[PDB]
Design a protein around this ligand. Structure first.
Ligand SMILES: *[C@@H](C(=O)C(=O)O)c1ccc(O)cc1
Ligand SMILES: *[C@@H](C(=O)C(=O)O)c1ccc(O)cc1
Ligand SMILES: *[C@@H](C(=O)C(=O)O)c1ccc(O)cc1
Lengths: 114, 114, 114
């Protein structure tokens, strides 16, 4: 799994330990080992949501399985709550795109997971 | 819908009001209310198109529905036109990836749109 | 084809000519003319892989066709090799997402490739 956060919140407001907290929480939520989880945080972005430049985030979660109707609602609760608590972003100004990847379409370590 | 523009144009060449103009134009084009539309502009990028570093842009438009053959041609004319007029990027150095998303795969406000 | 590299390696560690090298290697690997190939390198990113901030990369290769089980392994060897050689990133700290794009969902030059 890989999780990306793009946000207009400034770098200075991203707290220490945030990438590690994301890694641990995603490990718990998805059931996958933390050593496979990649997290990417992109602050200071030029963004608008609903025409407004108040804090917002556009996120993606890519996963080989563990993606689906019920699971995606659980991920959204978990991730919106983390973003609200740590970055002070309102949950109704966050979009998270969920992608269920075929293992043959993820390259790693000079091969793919096929 | 969410629209993202990556470009090597510098931030200073991104005109004031560009994010609002994109929000308005995408609302018109998709028929969705502007309160739903998210826009992300990323300037100053290290990019090449066809092996050259002249202005170029790599964009994505994600939408729940309203994606398809003829619609995508219409969006391309609209968006290439804006990028040409506002950022001085030639339409043959723009790629726009179109993604039709399932409502169950878009999180927002602690749940999904499903 | 479009190829994106996101990495926490610093901007100064990216060799001049890296974009041109990527363009030629991808043209050879996919069999597509280099005029069509777009490359985007994003250094200095706030990233973690497996909970650790050592150099890593998250990449995407989008292509209209030429995506599949065997192809994707040969791509992964080539790209992992090049990132290891040139940016000093260990190949087990790289993810490459492969996307097969329909031509009707790729806009370019005021239209689509359909
Ligand atoms: C993480 C991973 O290894 C898994 O098994 O889910 C991952 C998932 C999806 C993509 O595209 C890259 C890494
Ligand atoms: C915008 C939106 O909510 C709609 O009605 O389509 C949107 C579409 C798709 C994605 O992935 C995020 C936001
Ligand atoms: C490159 C291209 O034009 C091809 O022939 O595949 C390309 C492929 C896919 C996307 O999304 C953008 C550009």
């Amino acid at each position: 799994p890989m999780f990306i956060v793009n946000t207009n919140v400034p770098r200075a407001s991203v707290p220490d330990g945030f990438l590690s907290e994301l890694t641990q929480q995603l490990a718990q939520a998805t059931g996958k080992p933390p050593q496979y989880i990649a997290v990417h945080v992109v602050p200071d972005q030029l963004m608008a949501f609903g025409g407004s430049s108040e804090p917002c985030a556009l996120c993606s979660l890519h996963s080989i399985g563990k993606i689906g109707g019920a699971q995606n609602r659980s991920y959204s609760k978990l991730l919106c709550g983390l973003l609200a608590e740590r970055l002070r972003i309102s949950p109704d100004r966050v979009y998270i795109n969920y992608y269920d990847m075929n293992a043959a379409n993820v390259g790693w370590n000079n091969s793919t997971f096929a």
